Amino acid sequence: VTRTAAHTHIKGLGLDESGVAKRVEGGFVGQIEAREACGVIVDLIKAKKMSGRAILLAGGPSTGKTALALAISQELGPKVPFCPLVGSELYSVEVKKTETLMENFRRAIGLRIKETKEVYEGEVTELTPEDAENPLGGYGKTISHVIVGLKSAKGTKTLRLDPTIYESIQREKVSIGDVIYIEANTGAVKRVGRSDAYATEFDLETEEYVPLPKGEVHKKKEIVQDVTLHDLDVANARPQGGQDVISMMGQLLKPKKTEITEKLRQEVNKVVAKYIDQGVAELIPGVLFIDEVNMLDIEIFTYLNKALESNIAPVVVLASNRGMTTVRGTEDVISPHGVPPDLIDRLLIVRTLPYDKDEIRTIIERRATVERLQVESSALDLLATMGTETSLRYALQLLAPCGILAQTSNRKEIVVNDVNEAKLLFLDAKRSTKILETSANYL
Amino acid sequence: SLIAAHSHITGLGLDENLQPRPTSEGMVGQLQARRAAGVILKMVQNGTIAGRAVLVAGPPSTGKTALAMGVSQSLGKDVPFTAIAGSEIFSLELSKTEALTQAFRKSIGIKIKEETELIEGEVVEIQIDRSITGGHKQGKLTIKTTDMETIYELGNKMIDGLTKEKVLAGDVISIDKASGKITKLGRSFARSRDYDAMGADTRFVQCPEGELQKRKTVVHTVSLHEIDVINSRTQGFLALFTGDTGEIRSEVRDQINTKVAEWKEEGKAEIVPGVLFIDEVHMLDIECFSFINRALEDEFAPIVMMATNRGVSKTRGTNYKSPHGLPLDLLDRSIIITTKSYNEQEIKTILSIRAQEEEVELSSDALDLLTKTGVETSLRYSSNLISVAQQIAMKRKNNTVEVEDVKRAYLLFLDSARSVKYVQENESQYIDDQGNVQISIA
Amino acid sequence: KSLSLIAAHSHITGLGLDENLQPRPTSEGMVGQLQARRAAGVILKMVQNGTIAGRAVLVAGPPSTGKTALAMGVSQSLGKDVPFTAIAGSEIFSLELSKTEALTQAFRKSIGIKIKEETELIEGEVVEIQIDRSITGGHKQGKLTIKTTDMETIYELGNKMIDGLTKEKVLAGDVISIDKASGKITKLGRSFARSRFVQCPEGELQKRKTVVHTVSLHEIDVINSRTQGFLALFTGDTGEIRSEVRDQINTKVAEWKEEGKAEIVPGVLFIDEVHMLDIECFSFINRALEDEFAPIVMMATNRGVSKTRGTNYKSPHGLPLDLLDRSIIITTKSYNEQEIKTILSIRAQEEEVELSSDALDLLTKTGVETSLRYSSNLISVAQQIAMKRKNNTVEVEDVKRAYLLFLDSARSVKYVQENESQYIDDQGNVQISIAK
Amino acid sequence: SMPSMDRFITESAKLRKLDELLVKLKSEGHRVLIYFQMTKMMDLMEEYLTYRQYNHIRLDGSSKLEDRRDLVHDWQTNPEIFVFLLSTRAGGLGINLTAADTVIFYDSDWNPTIDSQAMDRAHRLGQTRQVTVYRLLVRGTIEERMRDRAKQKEQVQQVV
Amino acid sequence: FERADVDSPFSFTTFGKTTSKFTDLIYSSRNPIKY
Ligand SMILES: Nc1ncnc2c1ncn2[C@@H]1O[C@H](COP(=O)(O)OP(=O)(O)O)[C@@H](O)[C@H]1O
Ligand SMILES: Nc1ncnc2c1ncn2[C@@H]1O[C@H](COP(=O)(O)OP(=O)(O)O)[C@@H](O)[C@H]1O
Ligand SMILES: Nc1ncnc2c1ncn2[C@@H]1O[C@H](COP(=O)(O)OP(=O)(O)O)[C@@H](O)[C@H]1O
After folding, report:
1. Residue B150 dihedral angles phi and psi, to the nearest 5°
2. Looking at chain E, which residue has its C-alpha nearest residue C213?
3. Which region holds residue B371: left if phi is over 0, alpha if psi is between -120 and 50, else beta?
4. Angle at Cα A176 formed by Cα A172 and Cα A180, nearest 5°?
5. Which residues does the record give as ATP binding sites (chain A)?
6. Of the candidates A402, A395, A404, which has an alpha carbon nearest to the alpha carbon of residue A420?
7. Ligand 3 and C16: CB distance under 6 A
8. Is A438 exposed, middle or buried (0-12, 13-18, 19+ CB in 10 A)?
9. Would you call B182 helix, strand, or coil by DSSP?
10. Considering only CB atoms, which chain A residues are within 8 Å of C408?
């Protein structure tokens, strides 16, 4: 019926109105201090005043570092932008890593804008172009004006096109008996389809049929749009949308990333400031999440030191699972969590703790409940002592072969013999390493 | 086609209770690995879960890629199976993360249901009106069957279809509305007056009768990666074949995911998960493993099967040794299938199956000698010797491989250990690691 | 304009100095560091005089001791209209530009040309537009009654003004500005007529205004190179601009300067974390600092006797000695208890946080124990913990709860060294299992 | 991109189930009355009917009095008319709907007496076939509470 | 209550808009960023 993949039993942090977390609610078990710290961070993000705050989730493997960030993302909701990222995404073969980090920084700041649209829409009744006096003069186009007749409900208008508008009229291949939609902001034309006032079944081009639009031909409407600053940056970097030559040829060329200069970002910032000053736009700071932050090298860390001190940058969350690991790109320095101390001095570190046996048992119970399976209590205890023996992830991932082997014997419950069979078929890292050490030819 | 290495494996050879037969579908031996592969096959066929990593580990010449090919054969059609090697990730146009994202997204199919109209009728009248420069084209088509008569209006693409493989007013054609296909079934009118050129020596066919227009529900499968490449830019369908899809942005993938969820909600399209198979996964950098560790946790993720023939060895991109050449983070979230070496009876049955696949008849004593050499040397050497022995047998004009042909093939073509012995006995003849060689025989 | 939420150096509005370049104990958001602030004031007077060029100043000291704060104060006290290019050390390792070309662009972005010009404009309020049109659109006639709060007039309009008024449709009641030479008509808005909203202009209709343009040398270098347009100033693909057009711009700028048509303004190029540059960058800077069209370069670093990148030896501040011969060095010092308390009080007033006195003493004690930035980061988390229990003033236990929840560097190192068996070491060995 | 017609149908589950049952109701070739409570409910249905290009007419409170004569006359004469959009108390007071049997009560839960008058309009003498009264509803909503109140009023007015 | 409307890209432009025998419309889109 539904699909589950390593998550989606987690819905949020699951706190009270005072920020005190429960023992088990919202898909989480334990981790009370980390969930309270993440709730404080979520409240700080919702305060919408701070710029460039950074926390780091420090812990071991399989302890719930990605789950806390996903719970933060679901606690904020789809209204606030959230940009997930891996540490290996910053190395591109098209542009430098500093520009990619700047791009992902600007991709986490949103904006909500109420925008006015001037529209001419209706059914085309007549389309008559008139010719120029000399068409082969070299300078000046073939035609001079085109007369179009638009008919809508309770209205009929006649328009005289600029030829520049007529090029975008003709490129979507409109004709007599066609419903169109002209947006006066950019000159873009949408061909809705044939009007249903005429015949229907006599066509051979799988078209759709639309009635006449309600209201007058000329309209002004209010569309509420959501956007990021990075969208404006890539719109002004590669200009498409106009009716001139350059914006027309920009749609056909291959798109490529470029180093967007700071001057364009300052101009976009000034225009956005003018927009919010008028009472039109509203600014939404967001979250940038970077998992496996130890893959970053020293140059990206040194640029992060500069980028966190700007007055635009959002809240950035990091994660790592290294104790005393040398920083990549350096040769001798050893720093905690693979993160250099000059950036460590600007972070807030949140510890994540391992679990006990009963916590592993109830996590396995919730995972078996979510994946729609029925597990016997003795099999649950065997899975719990297996999870304490080897790993939590190994006990979690062996539930579905247990379900398949229980289904193949025409049964719904999972029993001890099924768990023993799944133990015999699939191995873990420790038994595989013990096979590797006492091996003949690098088995 | 041609006889390949794994052309004899059609399926996995399993029962209805997932109990593997000792010899079925071209696979012998390896009972527990085939049982686990059948469990993985059932987990893929259910399609309920996503992002499970399976590792197949063992010594060389054991049956890892043979097991993967058996899984791919038992998978059936309309389920994608993206099989790549480890060295294909490194490119000069795409990053490692982008190439791995494309490899992940090539393994999820979207099954889309569409409605179409089929028209089969005798062509009566074709009127085509074109401009002077040939740009604007429109027209009318009067088509008939034995019972009705319909006049249709034509578009640009339909007239382009009619102009190619020209129809000449009296033929019988077929029309698909959703696909836009033109298929000339034949000719029924049998006109006497014919121009010297053209000439529809199309096979005679009766005029179709009954309803002119018929409705049909059709279905077709596309991949997620094709949707992103098509929606990436203006000419994405050319980039699907030229491979010029350089670093598709994330907003495209988010909008495609939202539209796929919308199509699932409206009942138009369904999602079929597939298998991504990485052969020789140990040839990957640590950044690729770090990306895989987060890409396996998403909803739109396939079942990832990796194959390794390595023991404890140095991980690429770092300076420490790891089990199977893989870091412990990726080894934590994976379940491992272990393959084991063969006996003489299994090797004899494998050589019998490979001799039956290459259509080479073998004697009993030649089979015993091949079994003995495949016990001493590797299995692949004695497998490769069969075609050479067959060619030697055809040179002496007898279509049955005897013992002396295998002896001559053993003498003519060398092993690894024998070649190592000959190199180590005559080290001065070859160029060593320091570049010193003795060419002169004085 | 210039939207900004709160920055780490947003409380600094300039160097606090008197007329004798003496530093006040607390002025314009900067406290402490008297000698460094006086030296930066002397550097500011060097920049404002503008009679010398190509002087390199190095700011070196311990981390979190007023270096970027000093650079931000110098940039704020410089004011507007003077170029200031603040880059990082890792920003020049590009994929489409070489390191020397990126350094040349960053050098030439900091020298400006000041050009004054005059233009005439018609800014007014449209009373009435009358348009007479023919059947075929051959001859158009136009009357425009337009006014200010001071005058009133009627204009006969030619055909191109009719076309320019039909496009960008001007109705009665609007306030518009017309340029006669170029034909650019801008709608400023609507007037105060209830029957956006702006004020009807005063004075003469035909005004003559002088505008001042400051154009960087890099902009003229991009424009004069014919292979790319001005859009490379925004898209960023300038792509290895040749030296011949740089020579032509360098000659023409001096030609304009001699004729009095333009003026030279120099700026400041700030390189934050200068130790991350390569040796080939330092060798380029050693010769690029001796040009006439060279700004004042301020470099900030915190390394002490480290390895120079691109070599195998160790050098002071991560910089080779030939570069350090060409520089004068300003040295910062660590802070006391009172200055840390004053900095934390300023940051408390900046983020609109109300603090009790004992909480401020606890923050000062944990600031002189661990770090300045750690106490500067706890002060906004403690406000949210205060707002969770519905009170405005942050008390002592509110700081203690945030101290308990959020760790620092030394405690994290202590806990990692205590439980290192649960983490990944350098060799990649970890233990995930709890038992045995 | 325009507002999609199928996205307008599929975003409402009541309209979704209505579109499912109309497929078999038109495949059998039947006569359908559909009731509504508001003007805006019948200001949205004919857009869905234009997708199906069904023969449909609408009677409401703002209709002129003479049109109610010839619309009923066309109902009792023409058999090719399919969809009858009706208000609550307009077509449910003494109107002859004798050749119709399938009534679709979209939200007829405001009072049981109006619904009683409504199904007295079609279930009348002269009907030649079986009458199936459909009642579609969203479960677990305020309609549950109002259906509780309506059932209570039904039992009260039926016993008394 | 809220009827779905035209899903269109946000237009980052300034043009000639009306402050409300034929009507002449002319392409007049410009960029808000000025050099
Ligand atoms: N408190 C918890 N409750 C339920 N599941 C948890 C909890 N903590 C961790 N998990 C599970 O453990 C797995 C590993 O957690 P994750 O944060 O993704 O990796 P890591 O902890 O290694 O960073 C996840 O799939 C998550 O579902
Ligand atoms: N059970 C089997 N059935 C058929 N062929 C087999 C079997 N086991 C091994 N082989 C042969 O041995 C070889 C195994 O090598 P390969 O498929 O590359 O996997 P691996 O490298 O893991 O051994 C194949 O060429 C295959 O033809
Ligand atoms: N004299 C000062 N006046 C006000 N704030 C200061 C002063 N010195 C340091 N700070 C604060 O201390 C923090 C560290 O300063 P900064 O120079 O950016 O660090 P670093 O020395 O590592 O570059 C800054 O956020 C700044 O606000």
Report:
1. -130, 135
2. E35
3. alpha
4. 45
5. 59-66
6. A402
7. no
8. exposed
9. strand
10. 349
Q: For residues C58 and C330, is the Cβ–Cβ distance under 8 A?
A: yes
First to last CA, chain A: 41
DSSP D9: H
Residues C297/C57, Cβ–Cβ less than 8 Å = yes
Q: Please judge whether E6 and A181 are an interchain contact, meaning their C-beta atoms are less than 8 angstroms apart.
A: yes
Answer whether B170's CB lies under 8 Å from B188's CB.
Answer: yes
Question: Quick one: tokens of C112?
Answer: 């400006």
Contact D1 E7 (CB under 8 A): yes
**Sheet strands side by side (includes A315-320):** A82-86, A287-291, A315-320, A54-58, A348-351
* Experimental method, per PDB record: cryo-EM
Distance CA D32, CA A40 (A): 59
Is D141 an 8 Å CB contact of chain A? no
User: Which residue, among A118, A97, A28, has the nearest Cα to A68 in the 3D structure?
Assistant: A28
Strand ranges in A229-356 using DSSP code E only, listed in sequence order: 281-285, 287-291, 315-320, 324-326, 334-336, 348-351
Q: Which amino acid appears at position D136 of this protein? A: L
Beta-ladder partners of B189: none
Give how far B8 is from chain A: nearest CA, Å: 26
How many Cα atoms are found within 13 Å in the side-chain-facing hemisphere of B298?
19
- Distance (Å, rounded) from C-alpha A115 to C-alpha A303? 36
Nearest atom of ligand 1 to the alpha carbon of A366: 4
* SS3 at position C429: coil
A261, C102 in Cβ contact below 8 A? no
Cβ neighbour number for residue B387 with a 10 Å cutoff: 15
Quick check: D3 and E6 CB within 8 A?
yes
Report how far apart, in Å, the C-alpha atoms of A375 and of each of A6, A10, B110 are: 19, 21, 33
Shortest CA distance to A60 belongs to which of A374, A320, A397?
Answer: A320
**Can you name the residues that pair with B335 across neighbouring β-strands?**
B54
CA distance C27 to C33: 12
Single out the residue of A247, A227, A226 nearest to residue A237, CA to CA: A247
8 A C-beta contact, residue C363 and residue C379: yes
If you ran DSSP here, which 8-state letter would residue A323 be given? S
Strand pairing partners for B258? none
Q: Is residue C208 classed exposed, middle or buried when 0-12, 13-18 and 19+ CB atoms within 10 A define those classes?
A: exposed
Check pocket membership of A8 for ligand 1, CB cut-off 6 A.
no
State the amino acid at position A205 in one-letter form.
E
Rounded to whole angstroms, how far apart are CA atoms A90 and A88?
6
What's the distance, Cα to Cα, between the start and end of chain C in Å?
63
- Chains near E with 3+ CB pairs less than 8 A apart are A, C, D
Find, in chain B, the residue whose alpha carbon is nearest to that of D8. B266
Are B389 and B401 in contact by the 8 Å Cβ rule? The answer is yes
Q: What is the DSSP string of C104-131?
A: HHHHHTTEEEEEEEEEEEEEEEEEEEEE
- Of the listed ligands, the closest to the CA of A342 is 3
Q: Which residues line ligand 2 (CB under 6 A)?
A: B 5-6, 9, 26-30, 58, 60-66, 307, 309, 350, 379
What angle in degrees, to the nearest 10, is found between the helix axes of D112-122 and D142-159?
80
Residues written for chain B = 442
**Contact in structure between C125 and C171 (CB atoms under 8 Å):** no
Residue C73 · residue C30 · CB < 8 Å: yes
Q: What are the distances in angstroms from CA C88 to CA C270, C305, C315?
A: 8, 20, 20
Q: Is A391 on the interface with B (CB under 8 A)?
A: yes
Residues of C annotated in the binding site, as ranges?
A: 61-68
Name the DSSP class of B305. Answer: E
